[PDB]
Amino acid sequence: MDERDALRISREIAGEVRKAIASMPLREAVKDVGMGKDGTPTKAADRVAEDAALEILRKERVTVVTEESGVLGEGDVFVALDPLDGTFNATRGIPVYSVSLCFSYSDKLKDAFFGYVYNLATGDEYYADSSGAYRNGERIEVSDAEELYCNAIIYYPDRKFPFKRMRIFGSAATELCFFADGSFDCFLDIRPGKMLRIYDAAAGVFIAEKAGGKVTELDGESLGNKKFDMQERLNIVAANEKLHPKLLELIK
């Protein structure tokens, strides 16, 4: 499987997940239907989305690490799948949620070859491959902002900060892309619990890097050894290479 196969497969998945979600009424979608393998409830919305995605992915030689159903399959290509990221938004009719896919040539993030985030509410398509990062077919890149007085997405502000603005939308996959295209100057999940799972962030990180962003853990260590398994957890500091170290110092 190569980066063109991946785009083809992801698009097909985005299409089916969109169909499934849309043909579900809010009152039915918000319902708890079971316990995710991740340890959090699976909403009906999560279930229908994962089903449509898994239906397509089983026809491939891959191992899938997906939020509601855990690890599936045997292949050597590894796929981190968030079938529905921003489920809380989705169930409230709030239009920020996406299906997220990252593909890797091993169970570690450093071997990622394709990242893909499709906003299921707006239809915006983000992906990145060896050629670069795209929003709706157009090349994107991170902003040139050098100042801490900038536009930040941050989980969670636990003190007074210097940012121009702070936002929290409730979907890291999509929010990493907001950073990837330059809409926001930086992205930060600095929650002490390390809440981010591999499928939440893998795609977005990959896209943001292709878009020129520097993306690390809290101390600035590489994300390269982050594993595609249910146990993996992440803190993230993303910014252009000039803003990035200023952020590291700010949270020290």
Add this chain to the structure above:
Amino acid sequence: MDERDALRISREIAGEVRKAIASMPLREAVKDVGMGKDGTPTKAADRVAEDAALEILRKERVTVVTEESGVLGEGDVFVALDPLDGTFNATRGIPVYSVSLCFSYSDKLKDAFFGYVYNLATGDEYYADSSGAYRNGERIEVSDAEELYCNAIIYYPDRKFPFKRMRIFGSAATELCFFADGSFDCFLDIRPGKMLRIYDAAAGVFIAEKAGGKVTELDGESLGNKKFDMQERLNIVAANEKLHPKLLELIK
């Protein structure tokens, strides 16, 4: 002018604002075109929205307090107009922004008779009159949550807090409605600078009250005396009666 007149006029305005905005490309929309009478730049998108709204409002015996153009007209009915609230979002293709209108029989919020917020990106319609609060025709009401461990919209988190989730979408008009319909358990703008302007909050406050929410200033004081002028500024604590005082204690 009564509460049915206001509904008719607000809907007409929403339709025209959506038309005006949608007919503009992001690259043209995002441009600074002037200085608002509020003291912040007016984007192209802000200007075209305001123009559409003012064409319809100039034909009524009203005084309009609007963000980009300031105070206008001489009528005894006062209208707080945010022609585009969430402009930052709108210019970035982020689908959380609205046009906001509160109508009052005096220049003080205590005499408000109609509240209206129309999401320009999703078409959701929120309003409230003497009969209650509506989302897209359907009656709404705030959540019953009693615990601080709840779903919060808060500007801005500046210390560790007890909430289940924190969200910041960048449009208080819409976010006040998210609270009004129970999607979030509370809404807080506690910024030291007291940043909210009358047209940012008036409608949303009105709708949220009709929905059962208790909505006050920082110290629990009434909002009734808040004036429909450019000088007015607000901090907000909104919740159901049970949750509200717990929040007041939390932020002391």
